[PDB]
């Protein structure tokens, strides 16, 4: 049912990516739910939780390939949950993938809720060399997401308050970030909170080399929401 997974996924990857078929019933996915999604539960009920989530890590990557980002994110998070209190790095990679998929689904308040979970698991389990590579992506992500959303002071957790507080001249420090990236992040927080457009434009152009593709997407989103806000209807 693991090589049958290969069969029934390639029989879908063909018609989707290899020979694009704009005639798909959507048939091999509702059945792709078998083997993978199926043993996903069978593995548990008989008991192989250790590797059980690997089947779901393959099925979720497949779902994201086909263009189902939200369900892929759900399966990714479930895998992270399954592998968590035995292996930090595996579930942290899974959570990173889930946050990526959720940003593909344009689900920002759910991606931020996964970045906050990573950032807060990395710390309470950083007691390596990759933990201070998830704490450098999660911090920048979270700051860009809180600058994109702009939650009001009412519904703003203590965690996000602490974070958005860390980056104003009332505070200086870098945590895990490199100094230049921290200075750029601080200037960006201070310029967005003060309704400054040209500063954010210069910061976008200057930060593009230092941010990944996901975070460059998020910084473009911050800049766009600043320039043309979403909701006016025009």
């Amino acid at each position: 049912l693991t090589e049958a997974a290969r069969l029934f996924l390639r029989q879908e990857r063909d018609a989707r990516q290899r020979l694009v078929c704009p005639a798909a019933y959507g048939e091999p996915l509702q059945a792709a739910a078998s083997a993978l999604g199926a043993a996903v539960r069978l593995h548990l009920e008989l008991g192989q939780p250790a590797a059980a989530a690997a089947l779901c890590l393959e099925l979720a990557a497949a779902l994201r390939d086909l263009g189902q980002p939200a369900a892929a994110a759900g399966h990714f998070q479930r895998a992270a949950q399954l592998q968590l209190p035995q292996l930090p790095l595996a579930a942290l990679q899974a959570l990173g993938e889930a946050a990526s998929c959720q940003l593909l689904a344009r689900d920002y308040t759910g991606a931020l809720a996964v970045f906050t979970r990573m950032q807060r698991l990395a710390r309470e389990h950083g007691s390596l060399g990759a933990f201070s590579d998830v704490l450098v992506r999660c911090e920048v992500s979270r700051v860009l997401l809180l600058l994109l959303l702009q939650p009001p002071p009412a519904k703003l957790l203590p965690e996000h308050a602490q974070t958005l507080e860390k980056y104003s001249w009332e505070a200086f420090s870098s945590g895990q970030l490199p100094e230049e990236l921290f200075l750029l992040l601080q200037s960006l927080v201070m310029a967005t909170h003060e309704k400054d457009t040209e500063a954010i434009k210069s910061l976008q152009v200057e930060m593009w080399p230092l941010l990944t593709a996901e975070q460059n997407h998020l910084l473009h989103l911050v800049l766009q929401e600043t320039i043309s806000p979403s909701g006016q209807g025009v």
Binding site: D14, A15, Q17, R18, L19, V20, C21, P22, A23, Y25, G26, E27, L29, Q30, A31, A33, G37, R41, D65, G67, P69, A70, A71, G74, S100, L104, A105, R106, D107, T109, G110, L149, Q150, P151, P152, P153, A154, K155, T197, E198, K201, Q204, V205, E206, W208, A213, E214, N216, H217, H220, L221, Q224, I227, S228, P229, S230, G231, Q232, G233, V234
Partner: protein, 946 residues
Amino acid sequence: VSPDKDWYVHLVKSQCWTRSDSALLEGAELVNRIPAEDMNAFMMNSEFNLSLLAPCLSLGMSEISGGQKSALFEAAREVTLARVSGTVQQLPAVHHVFQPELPAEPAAYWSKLNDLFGDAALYQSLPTLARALAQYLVVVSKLPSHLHLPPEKEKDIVKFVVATLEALSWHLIHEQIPLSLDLQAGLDCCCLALQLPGLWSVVSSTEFVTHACSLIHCVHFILEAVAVQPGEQLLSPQNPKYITAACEMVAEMVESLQSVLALGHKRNSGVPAFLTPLLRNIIISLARLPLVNSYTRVPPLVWKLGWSPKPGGDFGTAFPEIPVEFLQEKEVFKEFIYRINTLGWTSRTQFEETWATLLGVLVRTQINVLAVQAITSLVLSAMTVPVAGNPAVSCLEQQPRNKPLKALDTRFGRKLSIIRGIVEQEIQAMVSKRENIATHHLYQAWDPVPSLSGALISHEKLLLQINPERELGSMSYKLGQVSIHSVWLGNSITPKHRAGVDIHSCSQFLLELYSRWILPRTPAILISEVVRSLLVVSDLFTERNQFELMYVTLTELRRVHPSEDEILAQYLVPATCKAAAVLGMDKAVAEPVSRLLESTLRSSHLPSRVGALHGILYVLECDLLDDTAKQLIPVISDYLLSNLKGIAHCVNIHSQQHVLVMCATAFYLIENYPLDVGPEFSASIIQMCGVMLSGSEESTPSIIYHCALRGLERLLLSEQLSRLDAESLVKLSVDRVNVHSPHRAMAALGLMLTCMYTGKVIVAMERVSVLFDRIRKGFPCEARVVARILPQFLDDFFPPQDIMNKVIGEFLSNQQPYPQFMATVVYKVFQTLHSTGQSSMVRDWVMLSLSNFTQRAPVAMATWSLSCFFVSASTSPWVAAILPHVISRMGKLEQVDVNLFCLVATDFYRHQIEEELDRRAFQSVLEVVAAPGSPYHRLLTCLRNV
């Protein structure tokens, strides 16, 4: 000062003649109120902020999409086109390809270029003009006859898009990465210009070959700079050299669409995910060019063999169609299928060529299955609505099963229409798979529903029609695409040929070749694919004898084929149901479809049951199901209840297609068979839908939440409901508005708006309180939307005396995170009171500015709120027409701000009070606040001067 037309225009110049992108929306709203006769001399002035042409075009379009004629849109369009022609008349006379690598080859050119795009005095005006041009081109598809782009400006617009991509690539070469908005504007112009036929006839001509290769070179260089690190290639396994370079570059890009530009692939993690859709669409539109189309359709595995003819097509690259002796190999055939499916077909002759090719391949082990799949997708290619063989422009045509609601087109219905179209616009922007949409523009979503009376149906007329089983925004082929009513209605079938291509011959040929191929040792994996292809093509069958032949073929196949297929039934059942229920399901022969459905619903594997449910939905479409022999109903309802009662607490575990089609069947039953689907049967699932909508963001995926919610909204909006489950439905709507996810809150808000506008004293106050709470503790998007719907809700539910205290109390507060929206809410309410002759209640409430106003710790915010309030409660034009100016400055206690506030309060004191005792009552509130400081003391002085 006299606040008149000239004072207003000066105040407009003060904000819309700088160069700043701070408050562009309010700038557009401010230019909107300029006299229509004196607007184009205001925008065609050298100091005008060119960043306002996109907000001005968007506001004008929202005014035109509302039916009313817009003069600001005419002005912004004239100015965009004149500016584009201007900035194109500066480029050099003759054009050379922009070899983004060849070291400055046309020196003079490549220097006269830098001097015209290396500087920032001109280059800064290329993407801020591309933004306007992309905001224009994205709405030419829904404009009147005299508002499309003229035929004269098409060459100039092509040259402008060429120049913009050239400038972006030049910046990438010399300077750093330009900007996200500059990149987006350039690629937006490119995509939307290759999407229109008027400009596609110009780019793809022969005197624009250098421009086409410039586009190809620049797009390839941008994709190389953005998607890959320096030093790597894109993919991980005579005539002007640039023509062959363009051919090979487009081939590489098209081959990349599978990995590097496939959103979510393990290799797309380099592209910043806001360039993936734009680049996909641009690459498709470039590959469909006559210059590179002939080369692009040949797989690379053919050049890897001994195939190299001598081509010529007025470029030198028109290769002949692949000799079908090459497709007998699998991989070459799969690559050819990918090319012709991704690219589509550029003309009728090309459709016929690839048709004959796949026929010659169709006469062998698995090449036959591939040939059948390619054939069915190829005939489905002509189904698309906008332009038939264009995957960049068009999506698959669907006619939904649900008829237009009759509750709308009424008094309350035509108001719910507006106030729910707003919420639906925002839900679209926030959760729709932008699948038929390439650019970033939000309020652009459309639907592929052509009228069967034809021209596409406008999206604001498809409120709750789109089959509630397909994901919001998903435009792929879904089983159930065309309703059966549409089959009876379009080609009149008693219960022609598609765009440019004779589909009757293709359909008849396929039907004969399929019937003669499955009735007599054809392997199983071939019979199943022929049946799937029949089911998929039966959306293009026109005559009734075609459907009758299909039905007799399928029933003989059922009789001959053994029951142990399990992978044939998934297509046997919905195809037989579609045929039997286009024949106006009768008693004689179309009756033992009920037996087939009953048998397949007690299956062992899911897809057979999803196909059975799609077949059931095919039957009820307008068959008298069974013929008042409806003994399928009890079966359908028992299955739906038994298998939805289980999947209501944990939904993400079970398949989403199953749940979606179960909900769609249940809603169709409740709305169209409400006397056979028992009674409480509705309430039962109005509970299943309650236990599903009330689940956490993990226990209920977003697309299932939105289906169930939109389907419930239709069930309530359709009058086919008792006032016992509808009463059970008005309660569920309010528990879902206080949720964290903004789009879930917006969906619940839409359902609440229908629950309020359809079922129609303190209940209305509870509902307005929950609306104000969603303004006060929501995100800026949700809060702006709610504050945009609030004035109509208020003026349509309860009289202004009830809430006038509440609106001002929510405007004047310390817990108010967005007072900049409540300013507009108060404005709309007061200006509504200035039309219904109630201009005395408004002064009665502004005279209640004693304690609420003038008591706000940030004195700057106190005078700002006073200015907003006294602008709102003003019967004078040019004073009520500056609220966008006063909202743009929520703090900013400058001196011109104080001059504005004094002038506004003086206008009020002079024109609204008119009672001397009340004049002294007004005067003796600035004296208590006093504030010898500028604002009030200057106001007191100016009032003493009056």
